[PDB]
Design a protein around this nucleic acid. Structure first.
Ligand SMILES: Nc1ccn([C@H]2CC[C@@H](COP(=O)(O)OP(=O)(O)OP(=O)(O)O)O2)c(=O)n1
Ligand SMILES: [Mg+2]
Ligand code: NA
Ligand code: NA
Length: 314
DNA sequence: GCCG
DNA sequence: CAGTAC
DNA sequence: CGGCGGTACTG
């Protein structure tokens, strides 16, 4: 739907975000969404005030954009913001690191390459800078998930592998590939990361590891980098989680998202004296875990109608 | 920034 | 722990 | 006045 007030607001929101004002940025995000959810182009100050997520200050900005066709605050955004955005788009660097690099006089990725001290993660993020900002066709995400599934089912064919994130939400393109792995017997998921990752390494599929606590038998996730074989391939981000079957629905719901949708659902759980995580839906406090064999049960226990993954793309 |  | 990440 | 989702690695 709408509109063009949001276009101005998003510039401001991004400026707040990269500069580290996360809660103010959150407020803008919620306002921007409320605006995008409204059917009718907002006209009245009082109208743009009745909307949940819109207050006195967001209203005024809306009124100025309606009257003047401009938001004066956009003329006074710090000159640092484009460089902060450039730096924080390095995987493994966030606002704190970006701000420090900026304070140290760095202005370009060449500055970072030649003069900044990089964490192991950040060096990987930098060397794949363009690739990690690309989205892949969902056809490619299928190939990547199948690669993971084949390696997994090769040593335990009962392993259940499901591509989640934007892929499961049906998006045409994917930022990365998110794969959930579990086992219906409730125990054969334990300790498999070593075997799975070793297998994917043997064929040269994995190219870099970002987060992978392989000294821990209770490792929950792998975040890394892969590349399919042959010409015309880019490096793609790969995220794998391995979960016990008892937590399947909550893990699936979480990993499917969207992130915004997860936050909304967890917010709602709080209002009902409950707590929702990737492990379980509980009553609040620890608390008592509720039985959730399927995603549908999570919605039901929260008093919600079920939403298909494509309807969770918030 | 928003909200209770 | 703070930072960054999902 | 003061929280905003809930959680998993890293060093
Ligand atoms: N702050 C976040 C980030 C992610 N997730 C969850 C929901 C989405 C899932 C995968 O994360 P991403 O890969 O970042 O999201 P995506 O929906 O798959 O989008 P993209 O196509 O950009 O990867 O993990 C979350 O709960 N909270
Ligand atoms: Mg994803
Ligand atoms: Na980053
Ligand atoms: Na490791």
């Amino acid at each position: 739907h709408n509109l063009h007030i949001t276009e101005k607001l998003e510039v401001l929101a991004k400026a707040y975000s990269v500069q580290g004002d996360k809660w103010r940025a959150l407020g803008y995000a919620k306002a921007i969404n409320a605006l995008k959810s409204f059917h009718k182009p907002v006209t009245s100050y009082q109208e743009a005030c009745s909307i949940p997520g819109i207050g006195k200050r967001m209203a005024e900005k809306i009124i100025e954009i309606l009257e003047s066709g401009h938001l004066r605050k956009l003329d006074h955004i710090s000159e640092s913001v484009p460089v902060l955005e450039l730096f924080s788009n390095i995987w493994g660097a966030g606002t704190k690191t970006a701000q420090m690099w900026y304070q140290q006089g760095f202005r370009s990725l060449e500055d970072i390459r030649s003069q900044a001290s990089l964490t192991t993660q950040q060096a990987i993020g930098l060397k794949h800078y363009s690739d990690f900002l690309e989205r892949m066709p969902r056809e490619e995400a299928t190939e990547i998930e199948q690669t993971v599934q084949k390696a997994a089912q090769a040593f335990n064919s009962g392993l259940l592998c499901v591509a989640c994130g934007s892929y499961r939400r049906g998006k045409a393109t994917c930022g990365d590939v998110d794969v959930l792995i579990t086992h219906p017997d409730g125990r054969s998921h334990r300790g498999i990361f070593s075997r799975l990752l070793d297998s994917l390494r043997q064929e040269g599929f994995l190219t870099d590891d970002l987060v992978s606590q392989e000294e821990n038998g209770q490792q929950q996730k792998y975040l890394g980098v892969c590349r399919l074989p042959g010409p015309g391939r880019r490096h793609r981000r790969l995220d794998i989680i391995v979960v016990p079957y008892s937590e399947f629905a909550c893990a699936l719901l979480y990993f499917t998202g969207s992130a915004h949708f997860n936050r909304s659902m967890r917010a709602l759980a709080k209002t009902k004296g409950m707590s929702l995580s990737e492990h379980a839906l509980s009553t609040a406090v620890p608390g008592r875990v509720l039985p959730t064999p399927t995603e549908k049960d999570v919605f039901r226990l929260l008093g919600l109608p079920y939403r298909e993954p494509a309807e969770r793309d918030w």
